Amino acid sequence: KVFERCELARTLKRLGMDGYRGISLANWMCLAKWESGYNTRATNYNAGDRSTDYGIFQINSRYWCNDGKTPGAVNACHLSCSALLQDNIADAVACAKRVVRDPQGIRAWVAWRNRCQNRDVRQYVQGCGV
Ligand SMILES: [Cl-]
Ligand SMILES: [Cl-]
Ligand SMILES: [Cl-]
């Protein structure tokens, strides 16, 4: 599914994302907008390294989830990558929390550095009741 902005924002707040390891809700919103345009079924194959990025946060199969088809991969989220293609994003959120427990935090996503870091991301949550 393709979330609407404010419904997403409340969905993520319910799932404990606001201020998770120091990360405001707006940053997560910015990350989701730029990774997938709020589309849980979004995928991107990386021909270069044989990995795939899954779902609304575009979580990569090499490190985080299992798809069976990525060399030398580990599954730190302990999930099938299919869990990251669901309408219900709880599993994707749990995995995203796990990504940011590692030592880069949100910096693990390059789209966040490009499109979010040291920018004014207030607009993402404006009007949403969060
Ligand atoms: Cl911030
Ligand atoms: Cl699973
Ligand atoms: Cl679902």
**Where residue 52 sits, what CATH number does that domain have?**
1.10.530.10
Which residues touch 11 (CB under 8 Å, ≥6 apart)?
A: 3, 89
**CB environment 11-24: b (16+ within 10 A), e (fewer):** bbbebebbebeebb
Tell me the C-alpha distance between 107 and 59, whole Å. Answer: 13
8 A C-beta contact, residue 99 and residue 58: no
Tell me the C-alpha distance between 32 and 111, whole Å. Answer: 9
Q: CB count, 10 Å around CB of 57?
A: 24
Nearest CA-CA partner of 62 in 73, 49, 53, 52: 73
| Containing structural domain, residue 11 | 1-130
To what resolution in angstroms was this structure determined? 1.5
Ligand having the closest approach to the CA of 119: 1
Tell me the C-alpha distance between 51 and 62, whole Å. Answer: 6
Residues with catalytic roles? 35, 53
Interval between CA 23 and ligand 1 midpoint (Å) = 7
Ligand having the closest approach to the CA of 105: 1
> What technique determined this structure?
X-ray
Interval between CA 128 and ligand 1 midpoint (Å) = 18
Interval between CA 81 and ligand 2 midpoint (Å) = 7
Tell me the C-alpha distance between 87 and 108, whole Å. Answer: 24
Tell me the C-alpha distance between 52 and 70, whole Å. Answer: 8
Number of domains in the chain: 1
